[PDB]
Structure 1
Amino acid sequence: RLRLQDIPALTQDHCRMRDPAEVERIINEFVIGGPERMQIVSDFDYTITKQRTEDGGAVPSSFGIFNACQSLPENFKAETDKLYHKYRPIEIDPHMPIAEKVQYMIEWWTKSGELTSGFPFDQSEIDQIASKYTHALRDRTHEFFADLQRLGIPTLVFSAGLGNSVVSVLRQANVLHPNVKVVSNFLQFRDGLLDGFQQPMIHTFNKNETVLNETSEYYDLVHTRDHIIVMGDSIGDADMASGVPASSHIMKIGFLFDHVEANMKKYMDTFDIVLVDDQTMDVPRTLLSLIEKQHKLNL
């Protein structure tokens, strides 16, 4: 039986667990179950991309990648910057109830969509920008996605960001394998012009059962997958799989980098494993390797 003290990646100082015995139990369940029961649901911005780079270069968000493109109206990045100035403080307000935050985030994504309308746009601009950031993914991301593909594990990248940017980055990093799907806000085009974003709207606080559930198209791909790894860097990522009705065991992994001491309690109450300044996929990959080892024995 697997014991945490025998799993090196989980014994490191930066791996924090509120209840190590529960984490150990969940791991043993995933290993008993095999890869055929597993699915992954992961955030993109600052989960798949790094929170901290080695060379100190900045990493933009998926929206930032879009805003860096050259063929935007001269008005554009300034106007989105204004909207950011208004709504970002609200997004991170520590006192505001989630219901109020949700009203405001709906406003932000709506207005952002309305700005992103009325002019033509070539996806290749996005590709040119995204190409500069394929070197900014977490260490061993390539190996992680290769493991998932080899094991046939469905992997959903569930992002409140700009989907076209997410897809461009993953595709160019050679990790957008057939088992990987992206649910996000994609640019809508009509008669050759941008027309905002394709519904449904996905913002920071509805990445849950109200968007991803048993009526979703994606559900048919994963309805037999009751063991889930959920990965993200925000508290708002912890519910990404809440709409999967027959899940039996979920391991929630949170990457914590900003304001570590202030956020530590909340993160440890929300995630099963909290990874403090861990710019690698070595912990998720550890889980996959133990699942695969047993799969091989059973074969």
Structure 2
Amino acid sequence: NPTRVEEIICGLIKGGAAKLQIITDFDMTLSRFSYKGKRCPTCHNIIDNCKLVTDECRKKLLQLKEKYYAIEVDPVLTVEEKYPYMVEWYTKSHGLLVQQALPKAKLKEIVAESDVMLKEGYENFFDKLQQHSIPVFIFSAGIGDVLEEVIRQAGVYHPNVKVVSNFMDFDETGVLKGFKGELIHVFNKHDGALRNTEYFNQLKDNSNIILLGDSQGDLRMADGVANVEHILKIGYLNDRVDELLEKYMDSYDIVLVQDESLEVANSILQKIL
């Protein structure tokens, strides 16, 4: 546990900004799980709960949620048995969203009036990384158009930041018809990582990596990195804590239980940069 974590961080310190890159999840990793006693929304929830979606549709999304979430957290099932149900889940949700006919124009309003919140310390996080031109690869199974507007309106969509997620596909009217590329969901981030080899091949020298996640599946996000000399994995354990603590402890290097800040990441960066 602790000696190894320190030997990784020392590796990171020695390499400095010159060798560093960040790979990180968005939902519940950069954004908060809860705030002042209320649950906070995922990207998908921002759209689910906004003015441009009817109640009957919001009912149907909740019916899906409790059908498929129950299957997702099901302990008995191996992750490959769950894999099709997850694929089925994301398709129907987007299917329901596509029928609502979301205007691209409205997205900035929806995010503006949402309950979304980035973790405490995010300004320091993004600004320090921008200052030293550290590449940031945000890799999310949410909605790209939503995510982008959150960090844009927060003032931290700097030029070093790359976003890979499920992006919306609009018609000639600017009305949503579907989603682009191949679906990114909770269990298949290994595939997306290898698909972005073009990006990582340009950062061969950046052999020091910090990976921030909140699910088990986020552990695969560095499978496309060209050269790995040192990698540190910081994991936010926000929910299902008693069930998953042992397991997170055995796979992430630093486990932060119900921690709504980035101050551990920030403190480590202060040392490296």
Are positions 1:165 and 2:146 aligned together?
yes
Confirm whether residue 186 of structure 1 aligns to residue 167 of structure 2. Answer: yes
TM-score of the two chains, using structure 1 as the length reference: 0.84
Distance in 1 (CA, whole Å) between partners of 2:21 and 2:113 is 29
Task: Mark the runs of 5 or more structure 2 residues left unpaired by the alignment.
Answer: none
Choose from 55, 64, 77 the match for 2:45.
Answer: 64
One-letter code of the match for 1:30? L
2:136 maps to 155
On the 8 A contact 1:115/1:196 being kept in 2, the answer is no
Q: In the TM superposition, what are the counterparts of 1:97-246 in structure 2 within 5 Å?
A: 97-118=78-99, 120-132=101-113, 136-192=117-173, 193-208=175-190, 210-213=191-194, 216-246=197-227
Find out whether 1:22 has 2:4 as its counterpart.
yes
Say if 1:76 and 1:135 are closer, same or farther in 2 by CA, change over 3 A.
Answer: closer
Alpha-carbon contact 1:114-1:195 (below 8 Å) kept = no
For residue 73 of structure 2, what is the aligned residue in structure 1? 92
Letter in 2 for 1:158: F
Q: Do 2:104 and 2:170's aligned partners in 1 also have CA atoms closer than 8 Å?
A: no
Determine the C-alpha separation between the residues in 1 that align with 2:160 and 2:257: 29
Moved more, 80-89 or 220-229: 220-229
For the residue of structure 1 that corresponds to 2:189, the secondary structure is coil
Q: CA deviation at 1:62?
A: 0.4
- Deviation of the 1:211 alpha carbon: 0.9
Q: C-alpha separation between the residues in 2 aligned to 1:117 and 1:238?
A: 31
> Contact conserved, 1:229 with 1:250, CA < 8 A, in 2?
yes
Asked whether 1:52 is paired with 2:34, we answer yes
Superposed displacement of residue 34, structure 1: 1.4
Q: Equivalents in 1 of 2:91, 2:242: separation in Å?
A: 34
1:92 offset after TM fit, Å?
Answer: 1.6
CA distance 1:140–1:134, shift in 2 (3 Å):
farther
Q: Give the match for residue 31 of structure 1.
A: 13
Contact conserved, 1:213 with 1:219, CA < 8 A, in 2? no
Distance 2:204 2:115 in 1: 31
In the aligned structure 1, how far is the partner of 2:172 from the partner of 2:246?
A: 50
Partners of 2:56 and 2:139 in 1: CA distance: 30
What CA distance in whole angstroms lies between the structure 2 residues aligned with 1:74 and 1:211?
A: 34
- The 1-side partners of 2:184 and 2:137 are apart by 14
Q: CA deviation at 1:121?
A: 2.5
Q: C-alpha distance in 2, partners of 1:44/1:140?
A: 15
Q: Is the 8 A contact 1:120 1:194 kept in 2?
A: yes
TM-score, structure 2 length as denominator? Answer: 0.92
Q: CA deviation at 1:214?
A: 6.4
Partner of 1:40: 22
| DSSP-derived class of the 1:231 partner | strand
Cα distance in structure 1, aligned partners of 2:53 and 2:212: 33
Amino acid paired to 2:265: P
Q: Distance in 2 between matches of 1:51 and 1:111?
A: 24
Mapped contact 1:233–1:256 kept (Cα < 8 A): yes
Residues 69/150 of structure 1: CA separation in 2 closer, same or farther (3 Å cut): same
Query: Once the two structures are aligned, what percentage of the paired residues are identical?
Result: 39
CA pair 109-261 structure 1, distance change in 2 beyond 3 A: closer
**Corresponding letter in the other structure for 2:264:** V
Report Cα offsets for 1:145-200 as digits up to 9, x if no partner.
00110111111111111121111111111111111111111111123232221112
In 2, Cα distance between equivalents of 1:169 and 1:77: 22
* d(CA) in 1 for partners of 2:96, 2:197: 28
Per the TM alignment, residue 79 of structure 1 is displaced from its structure 2 partner at its CA by: 2.4
For 1:280, the aligned partner's letter is S
1:291 deviates by: 0.8
Matching residue of 2:270: 289
Q: Which residue of 2 aligns with 1:9?
A: none
CA drift of 1:277 comes to 2.3
Moved more, 257-266 or 174-183: 257-266
One-letter code of the match for 2:245? M
Corresponding residue for 2:258?
277
